Amino acid sequence: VSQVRQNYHSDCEAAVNRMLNLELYASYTYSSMYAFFARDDVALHNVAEFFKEHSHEEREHAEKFMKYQNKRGGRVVLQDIKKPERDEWGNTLEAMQAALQLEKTVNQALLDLHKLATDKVDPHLCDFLESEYLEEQVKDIKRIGDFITNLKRLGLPENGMGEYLFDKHSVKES
Template sequence: MLLRASPAFSLLANNGVDAQSLSSPNSLSNSLTSSSSFLRIPSAKNPNGGFSVSAALPESNSRPLTGVIFEPFEEVKKELSMVPTVPQVSLARQKYTDECEAAINEQINVEYNVSYVYHAMFAYFDRDNVALKGLAKFFKESSEEEREHAEKLMEYQNKRGGKVKLQSILMPLSEFDNEEKGDALHAMELALSLEKLTNEKLLNLHQVAEKSNDVQLQEFVEGEFLNEQVEAIKKISEYVAQLRRVGKGHGVWHFDQVLLQEGDAAAA
């Protein structure tokens, strides 16, 4: 918004400072010190329009501020001319590149694919002949969390004026038993790999935002995803280390019970 003021000399004169006193630095200093109202002083770069304001005594607050003209639409003329009139074009979109829009849609697809795999793991461990309820609950919650991430990205895409384009989701595995490692360790190692892949994709998204100089998107990725992703990698890494210790027998059942109790305690 542009702000234009009357010449500084006339404003100073209106507030009790003689314009002729500006010819002497000492006189100007004395005038400024003795003045009890706010003062406007010419700027060196803009002697006709620049001014600064100092504190005023209460009795001077009633004096009107004269010589100021507001032109609220002067600086938005360019933006007004760029407001789209076609119904299919977003009105909210601003400095949001096609590269960022495409990267967001790619990350949405990543989150949905990971959610789909976790849901398949939930179904496997929930079988009556597997019956590891702690692992089933853990992977079900993990699936829901990844789906929430996808929805959060979709909401952000709409907020920035982009278009959500959902892509195909690959069919996940339905069997997770492994002759050497067992099903629990094999599934948890796969989960760790998926979390690291998701983190790598998020870092790529952040890099695209950085190249596009999209500070807001960088902040969104950092604040909503990256820290949580690092914590998830640490937690699942610990689960993998524990399952490697307990083997494939009774230790897996004990691990599952502890995991189930931890989930119940967190819910409470």
């Protein structure tokens, strides 16, 4: 047993390792979306940069779980990072729809970890999730939903002019 460990259940330790992996998986998916939108035959570079920034965010969130594990006296255990589900992402609407689903998947895993922490009477882990993850997660889901609404309004997938305009106005100039 680690000399620092106190009130830290083995199940929570394992679930934090699984969260770490899921954040890395999410980062890698967003990296794939970045590369797709930067293709010469896609060429929506502000959309590409949005996804690149989200990849970096998810990697930072993985790092925060590594540090959490060590602070509690758990032990980081890494697994393979699975490649993304698709190699090509269709268009801005399909990608944003996939991002919404990804963000909801990550949110459900966070919520499930909060349930576990609650069951194991671990208020430090509850706090960590509430303070560092849950709200920023709700904000991301909201933003992507707002984007999907606007992509539909702009006539995606058919309306290429609409897609062009989204890249100029909805996402920040890179």
